[PDB]
């Protein structure tokens, strides 16, 4: 979130300013396409198990 969010220092905020509307707008799709794809294979989930505290 800190490095790629709708934040100030935002790598996005910077790529927009440094490269332009266009270049940065494309930047999303890419960072996306790579990651989303990767996640598709690495998987990820959540279940009651994520909400239980240590025995003690």
């Amino acid at each position: 979130k800190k490095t790629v969010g709708s934040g100030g220092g935002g790598l996005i905020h910077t790529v927009m300013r440094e490269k332009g509307p266009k270049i940065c707008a494309e930047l999303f799709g890419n960072i996306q396409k790579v990651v989303n794809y990767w996640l598709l294979h690495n998987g990820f989930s959540i279940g009651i198990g994520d909400a239980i505290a240590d025995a003690s």
Binding site: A25, E26, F28, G29, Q32, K33, N36
Partner: protein, 55 residues
């Protein structure tokens, strides 16, 4: 009610995001595209394509 804002070549349906669409795109259901038109004057650059689209 009628002047500062009126109902207006428009369409509306349900959204669902698509992770394979350039940031600025917006997938439109064929159905809709086949309903909304666009007045393009005939010009010797697009006559050929238009006469096709028309047929």
């Amino acid at each position: 009610g009628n002047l500062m804002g009126k109902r207006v070549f428009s369409a509306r349906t349900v959204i669902s995001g698509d992770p394979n669409l350039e940031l600025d795109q917006v997938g439109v259901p064929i159905s809709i595209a086949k309903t909304l038109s666009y007045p393009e004057t005939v010009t010797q650059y697009n006559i050929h394509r238009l006469t096709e689209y028309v047929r």
